[PDB]
Symmetry: C3
Subunit: 132 residues, 3 copies
């Protein structure tokens, strides 16, 4: 399913979280874009999406987004990244998915821990994409 | 007048200020670029400009600039951002303006305070543009 | 030989180094790209390259790379940047070179010192390119 490079920074004193969708590579040619959903517990509270890159298994997005965090910490916040193939005339297929959050299974888990442990530091990591 | 997303980082021990013009959105189609002027008190001491994005109310610029700061603090330094419409054959019109500095009125004010309070941290914020 | 703007951040607790190739200017028109080699002592342990920008003495690359550092510090690590002209049908010529490392001669030297002195801070600097 490929890999996705993302950078996040938690502005702890101002309750914002900045998320940069940097690049994807080794995607399963597709016309990728990335959708970013922000959840508070299980409720989606915000969504963003990048521009689409045409016909390529590797795509530089470089898109920074700013999220408002409606609570005093990231404990119940999670971020969902969806790499989708833009296709006219049909529903866009999910190429891969990545979740970061306090209970996220590994990759996503450690990156989120670091984000919470180091507020105000932008941290970037490559993650393997899962089925979505 | 739209909005402009910018990130700044004050390298206090080396007297440089890095300014990233990230994106504009909801611009009043125009062919936007952004000009960045740096002032020490009321004297312009440096200027930069981005490339132009063609025919669009939303534009990803992603342009980082490095400014030399000729004094030991940011107390008398201010940064002026101008979103302009590139038009051949006439003076380019100012679509909107944003000022950050110690006496700047609100948005620009708080972002600058944070920049001075947190040297070496890159901080990004959306700002409403004013008439210019 | 022109100049190259690069930003680096040493994630000291996780042994990764993030390197952003931002822009080149005043290049000697060429079709520039940048190759980035990582050395541990004198052995190349990783390599990356940007996309190429066509026919221009100034080029925005904005490419972030993540390097694994196989040791506990940056003492014996160095990073080599090569600005090359992409040319079909012949070996691509090196337009300029830049080295950052503990024993690097000046520019590269001070930027690397700052990188080691300020782990987790992304630091950006313009450097003059040398013959390569
Ligand atoms: Ca808190
Ligand atoms: Ca498609
Ligand atoms: Ca599926
Ligand atoms: Ca000072
Ligand atoms: Ca125009
Ligand atoms: Ca006006
Ligand atoms: Ca160490
Ligand atoms: Ca060429
Ligand atoms: Ca040579
Ligand atoms: Cl790889
Ligand atoms: Cl979607
Ligand atoms: Cl969705
Ligand atoms: Cl929503
Ligand atoms: Cl939706
Ligand atoms: Cl945003
Ligand atoms: Cl937290
Ligand atoms: Cl990584
Ligand atoms: Cl909006
Ligand atoms: Cl202008
Ligand atoms: Cl002006
Ligand atoms: Cl000037
Ligand atoms: Cl001028
Ligand atoms: Cl970009
Ligand atoms: Cl600059
Ligand atoms: Cl200050
Ligand atoms: Cl904001
Ligand atoms: Cl110059
Ligand atoms: Cl090469
Ligand atoms: Cl090489
Ligand atoms: Cl290698
Ligand atoms: Cl090689
Ligand atoms: Cl990489
Ligand atoms: Cl070190
Ligand atoms: Cl510099
Ligand atoms: Na939000
Ligand atoms: Na579709
Ligand atoms: Na300057
Ligand atoms: Na004009
Ligand atoms: Na590596
Ligand atoms: Na060649």
């Amino acid at each position: 399913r490929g890999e996705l490079l993302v950078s996040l920074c938690y502005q702890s004193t101002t309750n914002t979280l900045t998320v940069v969708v940097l690049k994807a590579r080794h995607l399963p040619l597709s016309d990728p874009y990335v959708k970013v959903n922000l959840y508070h517990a299980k409720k989606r509270i915000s969504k963003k999406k990048t521009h689409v890159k045409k016909c390529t298994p590797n795509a530089v997005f470089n898109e920074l987004f700013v999220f408002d965090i409606p609570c005093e910490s990231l404990e119940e916040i999670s971020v969902e990244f969806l790499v989708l193939d833009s296709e006219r005339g049909s529903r866009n297929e999910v190429i891969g998915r990545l979740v970061l959050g306090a209970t996220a299974e590994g990759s996503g888990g450690g990156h989120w821990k670091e984000i919470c442990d180091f507020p105000r530091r932008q941290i970037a990591k490559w993650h393997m994409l899962c089925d979505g």
